[PDB]
Amino acid sequence: MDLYSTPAAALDRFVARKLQPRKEFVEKARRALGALAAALRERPRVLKTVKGGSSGRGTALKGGCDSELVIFLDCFKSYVDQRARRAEILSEMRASLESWWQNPVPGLRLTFPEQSVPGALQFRLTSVDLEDWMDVSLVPAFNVLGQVKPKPQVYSTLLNSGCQGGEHAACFTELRRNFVNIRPAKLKNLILLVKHWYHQVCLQETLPPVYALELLTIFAWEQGCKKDAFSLAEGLRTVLGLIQQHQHLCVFWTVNYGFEDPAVGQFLQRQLKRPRPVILDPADPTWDLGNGAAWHWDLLAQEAASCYDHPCFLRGMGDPVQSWKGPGLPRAGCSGLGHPIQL
RNA sequence: GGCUUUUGACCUUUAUGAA
RNA sequence: UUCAUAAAGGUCAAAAGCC
């Protein structure tokens, strides 16, 4: 990798030069999605349109990224309605996209992949370059959050819906975006670095969603660093060390839900007993981004384990950078991590 | 020392949709 | 009164690049 060959001391320059998105493309994309939101709301009433995905979370990389545009509709009054009103809503959105694109944003080509995701209309905006692109997922959702920690009823009702894990993740996009986007700038730079490492591994399927590594990075920094200023190499080394320990990973946050409601609390306990890694979306307790052996964490671990023999993990005269230390992080004597740290 | 960029929070406006 | 997206201006904070 170019990442590997970059000395640890030059990592901030690598992030700035290779990983941070192109300002020009970001703006063109922003006004495009702004105009699409405009066309959708101007015509089921649109209550609210919020931005999620890597772009909305603040974790988009240069040269290819994803975005989610969540369209909250007043025709949904229960979670199960999104599943019920799915084909017909998405049908209307396709017509809206056609209308919208009759006034195209000048620097972008509109294309469509195969529709992989039920409950979403996916399309791509690519630059003329063609050095940058955004895979957009347009997702109708029920506005359970209204207009702040959610009342526990928000999540007990979710459980009563009988939904699949993360099936209604879009409903909580505002919370998810706030969790990741409202963070010290350098932490977000580290996230970009981690995601870039992940992307290069992928190029060289069925791996964990990228969002899983965003959470793991936030976990690493919260347990081992917590400062606005720190070194990227050590953070990266810490994250890769956690990945090697995937069988011991059990990570969650109580920012949006907790144990105080018996129903929600009892579900949280069950989620935490699932095959590791378990990494619960802080916005949606039903969405496990670890998910046991479902995803090939082993392949990520295999690459992590052998990649330390590189300039990006070396300072001075070949002194290996050290993983951060702290409550949730690899310990010298211990084989486990003591996860979940809260329990 | 100089130069430029990114990201938040907050304040003052504006458009649109909504409660 | 509030919420959302987009835009204009301002204050503050953190990080980063080059010389």
Side-chain angles (χ1 to χ4, degrees), chain A residues 276-301:
Chain A
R276 304 184 176 187
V278 32
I279 300 166
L280 298 183
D281 173 14
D284 178 346
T286 69
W287 193 17
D288 177 14
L289 284 114
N291 205 6
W295 296 311
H296 273 103
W297 285 91
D298 58 341
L299 289 177
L300 259 32

PDB file of all heavy atoms in Angstrom, chain A residues 276-301:
ATOM      1  N   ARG A 276     -19.326 -13.316  19.254  1.00  0.00           N
ATOM      2  CA  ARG A 276     -18.494 -12.137  19.026  1.00  0.00           C
ATOM      3  C   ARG A 276     -17.769 -12.193  17.673  1.00  0.00           C
ATOM      4  O   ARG A 276     -17.504 -13.281  17.158  1.00  0.00           O
ATOM      5  CB  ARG A 276     -17.538 -11.929  20.210  1.00  0.00           C
ATOM      6  CG  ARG A 276     -18.290 -11.814  21.546  1.00  0.00           C
ATOM      7  CD  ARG A 276     -17.393 -11.512  22.743  1.00  0.00           C
ATOM      8  NE  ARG A 276     -18.214 -11.340  23.943  1.00  0.00           N
ATOM      9  CZ  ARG A 276     -17.759 -10.943  25.125  1.00  0.00           C
ATOM     10  NH1 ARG A 276     -16.468 -10.668  25.283  1.00  0.00           N
ATOM     11  NH2 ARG A 276     -18.600 -10.826  26.151  1.00  0.00           N
ATOM     12  N   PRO A 277     -17.458 -11.025  17.082  1.00  0.00           N
ATOM     13  CA  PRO A 277     -17.653  -9.681  17.624  1.00  0.00           C
ATOM     14  C   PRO A 277     -19.115  -9.260  17.643  1.00  0.00           C
ATOM     15  O   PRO A 277     -19.893  -9.571  16.738  1.00  0.00           O
ATOM     16  CB  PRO A 277     -16.908  -8.796  16.626  1.00  0.00           C
ATOM     17  CG  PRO A 277     -17.009  -9.522  15.355  1.00  0.00           C
ATOM     18  CD  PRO A 277     -16.889 -10.976  15.724  1.00  0.00           C
ATOM     19  N   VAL A 278     -19.479  -8.556  18.701  1.00  0.00           N
ATOM     20  CA  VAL A 278     -20.736  -7.831  18.724  1.00  0.00           C
ATOM     21  C   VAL A 278     -20.367  -6.353  18.889  1.00  0.00           C
ATOM     22  O   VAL A 278     -19.555  -5.992  19.733  1.00  0.00           O
ATOM     23  CB  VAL A 278     -21.726  -8.391  19.804  1.00  0.00           C
ATOM     24  CG1 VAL A 278     -20.994  -8.919  20.975  1.00  0.00           C
ATOM     25  CG2 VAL A 278     -22.782  -7.331  20.214  1.00  0.00           C
ATOM     26  N   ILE A 279     -20.912  -5.514  18.020  1.00  0.00           N
ATOM     27  CA  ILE A 279     -20.675  -4.080  18.067  1.00  0.00           C
ATOM     28  C   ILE A 279     -22.003  -3.397  17.743  1.00  0.00           C
ATOM     29  O   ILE A 279     -22.373  -3.277  16.564  1.00  0.00           O
ATOM     30  CB  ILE A 279     -19.655  -3.613  17.003  1.00  0.00           C
ATOM     31  CG1 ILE A 279     -18.280  -4.306  17.181  1.00  0.00           C
ATOM     32  CG2 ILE A 279     -19.510  -2.097  17.061  1.00  0.00           C
ATOM     33  CD1 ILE A 279     -17.357  -4.120  15.951  1.00  0.00           C
ATOM     34  N   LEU A 280     -22.702  -2.932  18.775  1.00  0.00           N
ATOM     35  CA  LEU A 280     -24.062  -2.410  18.589  1.00  0.00           C
ATOM     36  C   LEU A 280     -24.041  -0.967  18.108  1.00  0.00           C
ATOM     37  O   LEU A 280     -23.347  -0.129  18.686  1.00  0.00           O
ATOM     38  CB  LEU A 280     -24.876  -2.539  19.884  1.00  0.00           C
ATOM     39  CG  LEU A 280     -25.069  -3.984  20.340  1.00  0.00           C
ATOM     40  CD1 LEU A 280     -25.948  -4.067  21.579  1.00  0.00           C
ATOM     41  CD2 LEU A 280     -25.664  -4.817  19.198  1.00  0.00           C
ATOM     42  N   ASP A 281     -24.789  -0.692  17.038  1.00  0.00           N
ATOM     43  CA  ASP A 281     -25.013   0.671  16.570  1.00  0.00           C
ATOM     44  C   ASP A 281     -25.589   1.498  17.724  1.00  0.00           C
ATOM     45  O   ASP A 281     -26.633   1.151  18.289  1.00  0.00           O
ATOM     46  CB  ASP A 281     -25.980   0.652  15.372  1.00  0.00           C
ATOM     47  CG  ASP A 281     -26.402   2.051  14.912  1.00  0.00           C
ATOM     48  OD1 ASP A 281     -25.782   3.060  15.300  1.00  0.00           O
ATOM     49  OD2 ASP A 281     -27.388   2.146  14.152  1.00  0.00           O
ATOM     50  N   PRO A 282     -24.895   2.587  18.096  1.00  0.00           N
ATOM     51  CA  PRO A 282     -25.348   3.426  19.208  1.00  0.00           C
ATOM     52  C   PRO A 282     -26.711   4.059  18.948  1.00  0.00           C
ATOM     53  O   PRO A 282     -27.329   4.547  19.892  1.00  0.00           O
ATOM     54  CB  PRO A 282     -24.267   4.508  19.308  1.00  0.00           C
ATOM     55  CG  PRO A 282     -23.431   4.381  18.009  1.00  0.00           C
ATOM     56  CD  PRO A 282     -23.549   2.955  17.623  1.00  0.00           C
ATOM     57  N   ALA A 283     -27.151   4.059  17.690  1.00  0.00           N
ATOM     58  CA  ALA A 283     -28.436   4.644  17.284  1.00  0.00           C
ATOM     59  C   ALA A 283     -29.572   3.631  17.259  1.00  0.00           C
ATOM     60  O   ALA A 283     -30.738   4.013  17.275  1.00  0.00           O
ATOM     61  CB  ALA A 283     -28.303   5.301  15.877  1.00  0.00           C
ATOM     62  N   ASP A 284     -29.241   2.344  17.158  1.00  0.00           N
ATOM     63  CA  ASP A 284     -30.263   1.308  16.922  1.00  0.00           C
ATOM     64  C   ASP A 284     -29.748   0.031  17.570  1.00  0.00           C
ATOM     65  O   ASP A 284     -28.791  -0.563  17.073  1.00  0.00           O
ATOM     66  CB  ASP A 284     -30.437   1.117  15.398  1.00  0.00           C
ATOM     67  CG  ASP A 284     -31.448   0.019  15.021  1.00  0.00           C
ATOM     68  OD1 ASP A 284     -31.859  -0.804  15.879  1.00  0.00           O
ATOM     69  OD2 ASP A 284     -31.822  -0.027  13.830  1.00  0.00           O
ATOM     70  N   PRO A 285     -30.392  -0.408  18.671  1.00  0.00           N
ATOM     71  CA  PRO A 285     -29.867  -1.543  19.430  1.00  0.00           C
ATOM     72  C   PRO A 285     -30.065  -2.889  18.729  1.00  0.00           C
ATOM     73  O   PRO A 285     -29.458  -3.885  19.142  1.00  0.00           O
ATOM     74  CB  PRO A 285     -30.670  -1.482  20.739  1.00  0.00           C
ATOM     75  CG  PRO A 285     -31.996  -0.905  20.322  1.00  0.00           C
ATOM     76  CD  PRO A 285     -31.669   0.093  19.229  1.00  0.00           C
ATOM     77  N   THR A 286     -30.904  -2.918  17.695  1.00  0.00           N
ATOM     78  CA  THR A 286     -31.139  -4.135  16.918  1.00  0.00           C
ATOM     79  C   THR A 286     -30.077  -4.376  15.836  1.00  0.00           C
ATOM     80  O   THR A 286     -30.038  -5.453  15.246  1.00  0.00           O
ATOM     81  CB  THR A 286     -32.521  -4.129  16.219  1.00  0.00           C
ATOM     82  OG1 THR A 286     -32.549  -3.141  15.176  1.00  0.00           O
ATOM     83  CG2 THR A 286     -33.620  -3.847  17.228  1.00  0.00           C
ATOM     84  N   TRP A 287     -29.240  -3.381  15.566  1.00  0.00           N
ATOM     85  CA  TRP A 287     -28.259  -3.497  14.486  1.00  0.00           C
ATOM     86  C   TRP A 287     -26.859  -3.827  15.026  1.00  0.00           C
ATOM     87  O   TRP A 287     -26.163  -2.966  15.559  1.00  0.00           O
ATOM     88  CB  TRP A 287     -28.197  -2.216  13.654  1.00  0.00           C
ATOM     89  CG  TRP A 287     -27.457  -2.360  12.347  1.00  0.00           C
ATOM     90  CD1 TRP A 287     -27.142  -3.525  11.708  1.00  0.00           C
ATOM     91  CD2 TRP A 287     -26.949  -1.300  11.524  1.00  0.00           C
ATOM     92  NE1 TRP A 287     -26.467  -3.257  10.537  1.00  0.00           N
ATOM     93  CE2 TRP A 287     -26.335  -1.900  10.401  1.00  0.00           C
ATOM     94  CE3 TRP A 287     -26.956   0.101  11.625  1.00  0.00           C
ATOM     95  CZ2 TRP A 287     -25.749  -1.149   9.375  1.00  0.00           C
ATOM     96  CZ3 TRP A 287     -26.356   0.847  10.620  1.00  0.00           C
ATOM     97  CH2 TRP A 287     -25.765   0.222   9.507  1.00  0.00           C
ATOM     98  N   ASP A 288     -26.464  -5.083  14.883  1.00  0.00           N
ATOM     99  CA  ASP A 288     -25.142  -5.532  15.301  1.00  0.00           C
ATOM    100  C   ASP A 288     -24.137  -5.478  14.130  1.00  0.00           C
ATOM    101  O   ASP A 288     -24.217  -6.259  13.187  1.00  0.00           O
ATOM    102  CB  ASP A 288     -25.247  -6.938  15.877  1.00  0.00           C
ATOM    103  CG  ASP A 288     -23.901  -7.507  16.277  1.00  0.00           C
ATOM    104  OD1 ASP A 288     -22.917  -6.740  16.372  1.00  0.00           O
ATOM    105  OD2 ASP A 288     -23.843  -8.731  16.498  1.00  0.00           O
ATOM    106  N   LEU A 289     -23.209  -4.533  14.203  1.00  0.00           N
ATOM    107  CA  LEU A 289     -22.159  -4.377  13.199  1.00  0.00           C
ATOM    108  C   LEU A 289     -20.967  -5.323  13.364  1.00  0.00           C
ATOM    109  O   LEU A 289     -20.117  -5.403  12.482  1.00  0.00           O
ATOM    110  CB  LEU A 289     -21.708  -2.919  13.137  1.00  0.00           C
ATOM    111  CG  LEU A 289     -22.881  -2.333  12.360  1.00  0.00           C
ATOM    112  CD1 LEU A 289     -23.740  -1.326  13.155  1.00  0.00           C
ATOM    113  CD2 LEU A 289     -22.478  -1.858  10.972  1.00  0.00           C
ATOM    114  N   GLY A 290     -20.915  -6.035  14.484  1.00  0.00           N
ATOM    115  CA  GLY A 290     -19.982  -7.135  14.643  1.00  0.00           C
ATOM    116  C   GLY A 290     -20.545  -8.364  13.951  1.00  0.00           C
ATOM    117  O   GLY A 290     -20.011  -8.826  12.939  1.00  0.00           O
ATOM    118  N   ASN A 291     -21.638  -8.884  14.509  1.00  0.00           N
ATOM    119  CA  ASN A 291     -22.413  -9.974  13.919  1.00  0.00           C
ATOM    120  C   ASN A 291     -21.715 -11.328  13.823  1.00  0.00           C
ATOM    121  O   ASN A 291     -21.936 -12.074  12.868  1.00  0.00           O
ATOM    122  CB  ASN A 291     -22.976  -9.562  12.554  1.00  0.00           C
ATOM    123  CG  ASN A 291     -24.228 -10.344  12.178  1.00  0.00           C
ATOM    124  OD1 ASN A 291     -24.749 -11.113  12.977  1.00  0.00           O
ATOM    125  ND2 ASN A 291     -24.705 -10.150  10.959  1.00  0.00           N
ATOM    126  N   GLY A 292     -20.881 -11.640  14.814  1.00  0.00           N
ATOM    127  CA  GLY A 292     -20.349 -12.983  14.962  1.00  0.00           C
ATOM    128  C   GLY A 292     -19.516 -13.442  13.782  1.00  0.00           C
ATOM    129  O   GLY A 292     -18.620 -12.729  13.334  1.00  0.00           O
ATOM    130  N   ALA A 293     -19.825 -14.633  13.277  1.00  0.00           N
ATOM    131  CA  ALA A 293     -19.073 -15.220  12.172  1.00  0.00           C
ATOM    132  C   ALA A 293     -19.737 -14.981  10.815  1.00  0.00           C
ATOM    133  O   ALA A 293     -19.279 -15.496   9.792  1.00  0.00           O
ATOM    134  CB  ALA A 293     -18.848 -16.715  12.410  1.00  0.00           C
ATOM    135  N   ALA A 294     -20.813 -14.202  10.818  1.00  0.00           N
ATOM    136  CA  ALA A 294     -21.488 -13.805   9.584  1.00  0.00           C
ATOM    137  C   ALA A 294     -20.546 -13.099   8.606  1.00  0.00           C
ATOM    138  O   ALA A 294     -20.652 -13.280   7.399  1.00  0.00           O
ATOM    139  CB  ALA A 294     -22.662 -12.910   9.899  1.00  0.00           C
ATOM    140  N   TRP A 295     -19.633 -12.284   9.126  1.00  0.00           N
ATOM    141  CA  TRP A 295     -18.700 -11.559   8.264  1.00  0.00           C
ATOM    142  C   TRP A 295     -17.255 -12.011   8.507  1.00  0.00           C
ATOM    143  O   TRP A 295     -16.902 -12.453   9.609  1.00  0.00           O
ATOM    144  CB  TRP A 295     -18.872 -10.042   8.431  1.00  0.00           C
ATOM    145  CG  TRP A 295     -20.238  -9.558   7.972  1.00  0.00           C
ATOM    146  CD1 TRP A 295     -20.861  -9.857   6.786  1.00  0.00           C
ATOM    147  CD2 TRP A 295     -21.134  -8.693   8.684  1.00  0.00           C
ATOM    148  NE1 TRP A 295     -22.088  -9.239   6.725  1.00  0.00           N
ATOM    149  CE2 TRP A 295     -22.281  -8.518   7.876  1.00  0.00           C
ATOM    150  CE3 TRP A 295     -21.080  -8.051   9.920  1.00  0.00           C
ATOM    151  CZ2 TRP A 295     -23.356  -7.726   8.268  1.00  0.00           C
ATOM    152  CZ3 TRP A 295     -22.149  -7.259  10.307  1.00  0.00           C
ATOM    153  CH2 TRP A 295     -23.274  -7.108   9.488  1.00  0.00           C
ATOM    154  N   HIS A 296     -16.433 -11.922   7.470  1.00  0.00           N
ATOM    155  CA  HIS A 296     -15.072 -12.457   7.537  1.00  0.00           C
ATOM    156  C   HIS A 296     -14.106 -11.552   8.284  1.00  0.00           C
ATOM    157  O   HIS A 296     -13.130 -11.068   7.706  1.00  0.00           O
ATOM    158  CB  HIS A 296     -14.531 -12.771   6.138  1.00  0.00           C
ATOM    159  CG  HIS A 296     -14.884 -14.142   5.649  1.00  0.00           C
ATOM    160  ND1 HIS A 296     -15.884 -14.369   4.728  1.00  0.00           N
ATOM    161  CD2 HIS A 296     -14.379 -15.358   5.962  1.00  0.00           C
ATOM    162  CE1 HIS A 296     -15.978 -15.666   4.493  1.00  0.00           C
ATOM    163  NE2 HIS A 296     -15.078 -16.288   5.230  1.00  0.00           N
ATOM    164  N   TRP A 297     -14.376 -11.327   9.566  1.00  0.00           N
ATOM    165  CA  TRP A 297     -13.450 -10.590  10.406  1.00  0.00           C
ATOM    166  C   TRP A 297     -12.086 -11.272  10.372  1.00  0.00           C
ATOM    167  O   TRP A 297     -11.068 -10.598  10.448  1.00  0.00           O
ATOM    168  CB  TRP A 297     -13.950 -10.484  11.855  1.00  0.00           C
ATOM    169  CG  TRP A 297     -15.063  -9.499  12.028  1.00  0.00           C
ATOM    170  CD1 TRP A 297     -16.408  -9.757  11.943  1.00  0.00           C
ATOM    171  CD2 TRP A 297     -14.940  -8.092  12.284  1.00  0.00           C
ATOM    172  NE1 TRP A 297     -17.124  -8.601  12.160  1.00  0.00           N
ATOM    173  CE2 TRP A 297     -16.249  -7.564  12.367  1.00  0.00           C
ATOM    174  CE3 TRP A 297     -13.852  -7.235  12.478  1.00  0.00           C
ATOM    175  CZ2 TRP A 297     -16.500  -6.212  12.622  1.00  0.00           C
ATOM    176  CZ3 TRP A 297     -14.097  -5.895  12.735  1.00  0.00           C
ATOM    177  CH2 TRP A 297     -15.417  -5.390  12.800  1.00  0.00           C
ATOM    178  N   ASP A 298     -12.068 -12.596  10.224  1.00  0.00           N
ATOM    179  CA  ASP A 298     -10.800 -13.333  10.193  1.00  0.00           C
ATOM    180  C   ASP A 298      -9.849 -12.853   9.088  1.00  0.00           C
ATOM    181  O   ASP A 298      -8.633 -12.791   9.276  1.00  0.00           O
ATOM    182  CB  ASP A 298     -11.039 -14.847  10.095  1.00  0.00           C
ATOM    183  CG  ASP A 298     -11.852 -15.239   8.875  1.00  0.00           C
ATOM    184  OD1 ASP A 298     -12.532 -14.368   8.300  1.00  0.00           O
ATOM    185  OD2 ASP A 298     -11.821 -16.429   8.498  1.00  0.00           O
ATOM    186  N   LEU A 299     -10.413 -12.489   7.942  1.00  0.00           N
ATOM    187  CA  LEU A 299      -9.624 -11.985   6.831  1.00  0.00           C
ATOM    188  C   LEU A 299      -9.017 -10.622   7.144  1.00  0.00           C
ATOM    189  O   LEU A 299      -7.872 -10.339   6.774  1.00  0.00           O
ATOM    190  CB  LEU A 299     -10.472 -11.922   5.561  1.00  0.00           C
ATOM    191  CG  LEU A 299     -10.809 -13.290   4.965  1.00  0.00           C
ATOM    192  CD1 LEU A 299     -11.703 -13.126   3.745  1.00  0.00           C
ATOM    193  CD2 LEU A 299      -9.537 -14.048   4.614  1.00  0.00           C
ATOM    194  N   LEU A 300      -9.787  -9.777   7.824  1.00  0.00           N
ATOM    195  CA  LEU A 300      -9.272  -8.494   8.268  1.00  0.00           C
ATOM    196  C   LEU A 300      -8.176  -8.716   9.306  1.00  0.00           C
ATOM    197  O   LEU A 300      -7.145  -8.046   9.285  1.00  0.00           O
ATOM    198  CB  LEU A 300     -10.392  -7.679   8.893  1.00  0.00           C
ATOM    199  CG  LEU A 300     -11.063  -6.581   8.084  1.00  0.00           C
ATOM    200  CD1 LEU A 300     -11.093  -6.925   6.609  1.00  0.00           C
ATOM    201  CD2 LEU A 300     -12.458  -6.370   8.625  1.00  0.00           C
ATOM    202  N   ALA A 301      -8.402  -9.665  10.211  1.00  0.00           N
ATOM    203  CA  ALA A 301      -7.451  -9.939  11.286  1.00  0.00           C
ATOM    204  C   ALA A 301      -6.131 -10.460  10.723  1.00  0.00           C
ATOM    205  O   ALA A 301      -5.050 -10.061  11.168  1.00  0.00           O
ATOM    206  CB  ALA A 301      -8.036 -10.945  12.267  1.00  0.00           C
TER     207      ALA A 301
END
